[PDB]
Symmetry: D2
Subunit: 385 residues, 4 copies
């Protein structure tokens, strides 16, 4: 029957993640955000505690955890800080295509190294000319004997300057009229290959401690063995990685919203205006109640999506619902929390403004809200045929 109770192992994972977050990430998150420095010690500590690369199977040396455990761990880490959590989950996002569409040789070679030492990997799909239209990318992969020549440029690549290897999606079919199901090929490109020109670090409004760079490929030689299932099969692999990665980003948004709610409540429990405690004004109490409702609903949505994908079904409908709702409620919670603190909320010495700046990408990256609504509408309509 229905159940909303964690297992003992999941409880242990949640306790470890919460302890690590609230005892390591929080004391230094503000400094890392202010300086924009890459949190190498925090990433190493997360790797040591087994909070990173959770999806790697036990055969390759990983823990082989499901998406539910990854979601709860990512929620705790995002409660810690969203930039650090994004940097950590970039590894899982890059690894997912290799895990789901890789043979034994590729899996061992490109995941045992991740298990042995705290390395990083990226997910190079987005281009300057097409970010939402995945079929609109123009990076070309030309086959030359036993190698592929890749030319093009990618933009907004998380861990672009820190990754050990990249998952690259390029258009193998030169025919513009070729269908998207047979035109794109996935590759495993090492970061040290000649011809890769990593661009400057991009400065963003939020999550300033994470590394986001543009990458330019110029006559990069990729061996034939570093190809996925085959030519023209890249698009399906890229689209199938989303079904397992979207609940994680939804969980991160939920954790950010939970942090904002905690800060707002803790501030409202001590501030006094008009001779009464700030929580004794009905407007503030109703605001807090609505924030709590949104947080609980978003958490339930992402947990449902994670359980759905973990059970072997397709969770595109639930994953899109959870991602969209979490992205919206994260921004709403962040702005409400900034409103609650008043003038101190607008100041940079209080955590709420950082959360407000960080919450914006959850409506942009990993599929914008409009794309999520498109997917939800398509699935809903298909349910009526």
């Amino acid at each position: 029957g229905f159940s909303f109770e964690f297992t003992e192992q999941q409880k242990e994972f949640q306790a470890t993640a919460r302890k690590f977050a609230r005892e390591e990430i929080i004391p230094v998150a503000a400094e890392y955000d202010k300086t924009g420095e890459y949190p190498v010690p925090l990433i190493r500590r997360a790797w040591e505690l087994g909070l990173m690369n959770t999806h790697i199977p036990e055969n390759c040396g990983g823990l082989g955890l499901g998406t539910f455990d990854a979601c709860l761990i990512s929620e705790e880490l995002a409660y810690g800080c969203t930039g650090v959590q994004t940097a950590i989950e970039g590894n899982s996002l890059g690894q997912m295509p290799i895990i789901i569409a890789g043979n034994d040789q590729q899996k061992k070679k490109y995941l045992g190294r991740m298990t042995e030492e705290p390395l990083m990997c990226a997910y190079c799909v987005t281009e300057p000319g097409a970010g939402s239209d995945v079929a609109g990318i123009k990076t070309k992969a030309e086959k030359k004997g036993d190698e592929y020549i890749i030319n093009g440029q990618k933009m907004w690549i998380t861990n672009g300057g820190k990754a050990n290897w990249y998952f690259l999606l390029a258009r193998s079919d030169p025919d513009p009229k070729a269908p998207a199901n047979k035109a794109f090929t996935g590759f495993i490109v090492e970061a040290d290959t000649p011809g890769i020109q990593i661009g400057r670090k991009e400065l963003n409004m939020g999550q300033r401690c994470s590394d986001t760079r543009g990458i330019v490929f110029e006559d990069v030689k990729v061996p034939k063995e570093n190809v996925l299932i085959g030519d023209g099969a890249g698009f399906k692999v890229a689209m199938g990685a989303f079904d397992k990665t979207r609940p994680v980003v939804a969980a991160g948004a939920v954790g950010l919203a939970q942090r904002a709610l905690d800060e707002a409540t803790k501030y409202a429990l001590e501030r006094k205006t008009f001779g009464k405690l700030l929580v004794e004004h009905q407007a503030i109490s109703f605001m807090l109640a609505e924030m709590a409702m949104k947080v609980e609903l978003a958490r339930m949505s992402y947990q449902r999506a994670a359980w759905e994908v973990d059970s072997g079904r397709r969770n595109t409908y639930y994953a899109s619902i959870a991602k969209a709702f979490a992205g919206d409620i994260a921004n709403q919670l962040a702005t409400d929390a900034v409103q609650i603190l008043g003038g101190n909320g607008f100041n940079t010495e209080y955590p709420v403004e950082k959360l407000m700046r960080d919450a914006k990408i959850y409506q942009i990256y990993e599929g914008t809200s409009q794309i999520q609504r498109l997917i939800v509408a398509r699935e809903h309509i298909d349910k009526y045929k």
Copy 2:
């Protein structure tokens, strides 16, 4: 661990409820709403199928089902029609205080009769002067020997003119300064007792097939044996019945929203404007996607509340969250569905306008949205102490 899978018995209950609803209630719901007639045959059929009085324990002849099964059955029935579902759930709402705070004699006497024949019961708490302020009622219960003399009037009583017996909450303590925890007493009052004057049927905007009447009590003699746990214990019983009844009304709102979404989608799949199908306009598709998201979130919320109360914990926080969110999304879905059908939506020969009229009470009765937000804020604040 977490699970979102029904049991086989729950699947059978859901199948029976859906079949009964969509094959009996729907063909006659419009006529019953238009004429305002009490749906006696539908209530009898629901009683025959075991879809009514589900909370009665097996000792008294009932099925002894949990609130989860009641919630799913009520969702299916509300998909059928909200007026019929409200009339059916009035029995459970009236019976809940007797089930949770009744001795063997009272339980047998006042529940075996419900099991044997399709009788009805009501829940008389609300007064013309105080509906939300439960502590503000002024019906007085004066003890005279081995009987209680009750004087006062109640307003907005579901099944007021059809109930076999009433659950009455009256203020036993005449001291105005007495605390609410020791001032109110619950009673089991039969409908045939002299001194009970049932008023005229009230005409409402929606759910016009349900019976809602005001009741006037004038020197009604109630035997001492028809009293609950004791004098001054009525308030806690009344407040504890809510923890088990609110998920049911939330499920009813969810079912109404699901009906509205189904009607809107089915209409949008055939209507053509500007040379394209009505679902091919991005505005309509986004509207449908948001409606589906709201429906799924509300369903998950009420299911979580039902599971929480079924596990022995206190679910006031989750029940209030589910009730508030379902009440809001029901009205939003109803008005969006009326918008989708255009001019035909405003007409009375299409089901959407009836749903829009019916959806309003879910933000009013069984605790208004403001009271739900008050409860949610109180629980959230208590979680931080």
Copy 3:
């Protein structure tokens, strides 16, 4: 410079309209809505006071008032009742094409009769197959000598069963690929012409005292003199009547919202819950403040649109903005007012539920909200070319 002060004549018109509304329409509006009877005495009284057919020029015997005065009068009448105001403004809506695109003979013949006696006219454009897509109508007008043969059916015609003559828009060009600018012709069709089959009165959710019927045309002979500017010029006339009619319906929505706000405030000033006046709870006060803000903004928007059209400019942008915003805020205000009254709000003996039922058409008829947003987006984009 800028000014927000009425003229003395406009103040006199507003005073007369408010007095007539609040002393005649309100005492009988509930009865007319409940019985669905056509308010003939109220229409006659409005005609006697000069509150109807305001756009007729002084040459034809009318008052020759601008759209600003019509807007304020319609706002007062809609504060009285929306059904009566809709029945009254149907005359102006039907007459506007004749006023703006009629020669002296047609204007005299078909407006002097309106001036002399309280007659009615309708606006037959919408068809069962296309209501929003005006270019999608399929009523055909075939020229036969000095007459036009018209075949087709219209749906949702205000004053359909009471009009003395109709303004009919039909597709003269049989070529499906013909542009909309040269395919439709406008006609002045008398209601007594043989071949016109008025259908049954349609029953709607709100404004039940207004007459809305479907009309079937079967070989109706229209003389050549009853044609507007010429063949293929009907579409531009129909689209230009909107620029002068939309502010009036926006004003009606504003008046309905003002009525809802007045009822909610007057109820909240006497109701007491939890020992305090209902207006002393911050939630209720904030709700009332937001309602007042919305009412004021909508009033300013429609007044701006009326002034813009009265100054000789094109006000499509402002008219669409005002119509959309007023339509939204009317429904929001109505549902908030129903929420404020609590259980009494859901009852039919209080005016708020009638306002909630009536407010829905302002998001449907005279251009749905989606069409208004389309027009606003088109104008906004054109401003950037």
Copy 4:
């Protein structure tokens, strides 16, 4: 009658302000925001063009413009940059109490200096312990012979480190039970007086080019001639300055929203996704239409408030409505504009993220949204007595 047409002088002022903004402020606004430097050259240029200190009467050497002209100028400047506009309007905010409650000597002495050279003034009311509760300030002013000794600290003072003199509000009455109407006194305190300790520059989320500092007063001697109307009259002066200053900040929010809308539209007119221009997707077009509607409504609201105060009436109701609505729509427009640009919107090399960061204070300073709703509710309720 009603009019929405500017005068020729107002058109000239608007043209000058728009030219200055879009040719001087925009090219350097990003650099000033990034470095946090005080825009001295821009302030000097605005002073030279007569765009600063507009409220000073012609007797003291000012232009003697009404609040309408100040509102339009501030809207243009805020379209330029919100930080520069805030720095400029700080002078008007500080000067307003002196203008409305100053004798000839004080007006000449403390406004002729502003006219002669580009000096700055501040408005010191807010304290660390009470920002919204103006009656809750605790800065004490003790009279000692012909001087006042002032002790206390102020927080969030615009132009705190750059002002030539301050308007200080202090509690003269030491009795805690004294009414607010007779307990506070206003002072004109020069910035060079010994005992004034200007704190460090505060770092905020947005408007980082404006100077906001905390000020500590320690035994500051203020001569008796630098007092306003008298002891206990400070509170009314402070509350009356709001009626003339709130429309200006509302206009600034409107200008920021207009800038966001312009950027979003200009980007959407060139970006192509899924083979179509980004403005050809109905979701984006509807978003733009709603943004334009909000901008127009907010502009009309603030213009109405400015005209109302310029006509000699009290505009507290309209000023609060305009301030609240403009503050809300500014944030909504900013976040929608960031959403439209997608990934580029989150980057710091595009203007939208700066607007999103800047828009937050319009819901915080000069009266938070909750205080505005309180004022609107109070005025609305008083209208019904």
